[PDB]
Amino acid sequence: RPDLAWLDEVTMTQLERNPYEVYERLRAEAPLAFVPVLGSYVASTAEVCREVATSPDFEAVITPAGGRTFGHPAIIGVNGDIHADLRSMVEPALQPAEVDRWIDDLVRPIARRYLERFENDGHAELVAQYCEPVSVRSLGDLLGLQEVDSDKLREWFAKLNRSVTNAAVDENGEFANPEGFAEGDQAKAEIRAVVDPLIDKWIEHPDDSAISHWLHDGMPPGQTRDREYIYPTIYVYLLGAMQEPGHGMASTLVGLFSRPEQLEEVVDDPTLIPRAIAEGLRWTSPIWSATARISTKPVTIAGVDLPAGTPVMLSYGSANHDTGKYEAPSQYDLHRPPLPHLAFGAGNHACAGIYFANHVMRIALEELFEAIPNLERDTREGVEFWGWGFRGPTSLHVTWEV
Numbered sequence: 197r198p199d200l201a202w203l204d205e206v207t208m209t210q211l212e213r214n215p216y217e218v219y220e221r222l223r224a225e226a227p228l229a230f231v232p233v234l235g236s237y238v239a240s241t242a243e244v245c246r247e248v249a250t251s252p253d254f255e256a257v258i259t260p261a262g263g264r265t266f267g268h269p270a271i272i273g274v275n276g277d278i279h280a281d282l283r284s285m286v287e288p289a290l291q292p293a294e295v296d297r298w299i300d301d302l303v304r305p306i307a308r309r310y311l312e313r314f315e316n317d318g319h320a321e322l323v324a325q326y327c328e329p330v331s332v333r334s335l336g337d338l339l340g341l342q343e344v345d346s347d348k349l350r351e352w353f354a355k356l357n358r359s360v361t362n363a364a365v366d367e368n369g370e371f372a373n374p375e376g377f378a379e380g381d382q383a384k385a386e387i388r389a390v391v392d393p394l395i396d397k398w399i400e401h402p403d404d405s406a407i408s409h410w411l412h413d414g415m416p417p418g419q420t421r422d423r424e425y426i427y428p429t430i431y432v433y434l435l436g437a438m439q440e441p442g443h444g445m446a447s448t449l450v451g452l453f454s455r456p457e458q459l460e461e462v463v464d465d466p467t468l469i470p471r472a473i474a475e476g477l478r479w480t481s482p483i484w485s486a487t488a489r490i491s492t493k494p495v496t497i498a499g500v501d502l503p504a505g506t507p508v509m510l511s512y513g514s515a516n517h518d519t520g521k522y523e524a525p526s527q528y529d530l531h532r533p534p535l536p537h538l539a540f541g542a543g544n545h546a547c548a549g550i551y552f553a554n555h556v557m558r559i560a561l562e563e564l565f566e567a568i569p570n571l572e573r574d575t576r577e578g579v580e581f582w583g584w585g586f587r588g589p590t591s592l593h594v595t596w597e598v
């Protein structure tokens with residue numbers, strides 16, 4: 197496309213570092229555009245993302261580097277009967293009535309445990325010391341990985357993140373950085389060594405862990421889902437389900453710190469924490485551009501005639517800055533009206549764990565503000581955000597008077 201020749205000079209590092217300038221141009225110039233370094237069409241506006249995500253003429257497809265990492269059948273990358281089974285497999289523990297039975301007793305003790313390690317220090321780096329540990333320890337316990345330390349769960353989702361978002365392609369459409377998949381492969385090898393004995397035990401001795409239920413639920417007597425059939429969805433969980441609540445927490449805190457009067461409002465009135473988190477997810481979407489759909493027949497979208505079999509990346513993080521929907525979207529504003537957002541996706545492949553994720557983030561922020569009501573950002577340190585596929589702050593240094 198001639199007028200978009202500038203996209204030929206967009207680099208993967210630029211998008212990782214800050215994708216918002218390029219995507220602001222895309223939303224104005226070409227809401228559906230082929231980005232050469234990504235090797236794919238990308239949807240940048242709310243209208244196009246929503247249309248593709250909910251269209252009967254599209255189905256799910258995994259991004260190329262996502263497929264290289266996860267294989268088949270990743271719940272995010274399959275359709276039809278297999279997708280229906282995998283959705284029925286994961287949905288029981290995510291049902292709102294079920295989450296509300298036990299989410300407080302799960303997350304609140306975990307939050308307190310991590311807070312107790314630093315709440316009297318006067319200083320902390322909240323990403324590593326609080327947001328990521330609460331996120332992974334909560335989900336890890338739900339899954340049945342109680343004995344996998346939070347440090348290891350965090351390492352796994354970091355390696356899986358880098359492998360899944362190793363998206364850069366060269367002039368021939370080939371992956372430009374094939375060595376970048378190696379740490380994904382090594383994370384998977386470590387996960388197998390840890391989880392295979394757990395699956396061995398759950399097959400014979402089912403318990404209340406989610407993965408035991410993934411093996412046994414809805415199966416004939418004495419049968420379990422094959423472990424090779426469920427492992428790719430385990431990997432999906434060990435990346436985004438482990439990573440994203442911690443990133444949503446942290447981005448919400450950075451946004452609130454950027455509006456000090458609003459941080460004070462939320463500390464004074466913790467019933468505003470859910471609204472603060474919803475704005476945080478719009479403001480810096482944790483899953484920024486990590487899923488995709490593929491056309492199943494010829495379609496015209498945003499003036500582009502697409503053949504059947506065309507993948508389209510859903511850059512929801514860009515859609516959530518659509519100035520057709522929001523005023524000054526790069527500014528965090530708790531008092532924005534509660535409008536629809538796309539941080540959880542849309543359609544049949546929309547996020548399955550919204551209700552759980554929102555509660556994890558809410559409880560974690562509740563306990564943090566109760567423990568450290570005078571929390572302040574350490575302005576001597578910068579906050580850098582990183583990530584095009586998944587985006588969040590790489591650290592969050594804070595201080596408080598002890």
Ligand code: HEM
Pocket residue numbers: 249271272273283286290335436437438440441444477481482483487488510512538539540541542543544545546547548549550552553554
């Ligand atoms: C703030 C935290 C989270 C955010 C922002 C988020 C966002 C998303 C997004 C954008 C997608 C892709 C939707 C699409 O392609 O249209 C997704 C998929 C998914 N998420 Fe969430 N997620 C979060 C946490 C979680 C958690 C904690 C779990 C599990 C306990 C979870 C389970 C899933 C599943 C199973 C899918 C795949 C759905 C499917 O393909 O059918 N997510 N999520």
Ligand SMILES: COc1cccc(OC)c1O
Pocket residue numbers: 262272360431432433434435436437483486487
């Ligand atoms: C590409 O990887 C993912 C995409 C969307 C959601 C995920 O975890 C829930 C995830 O791991």
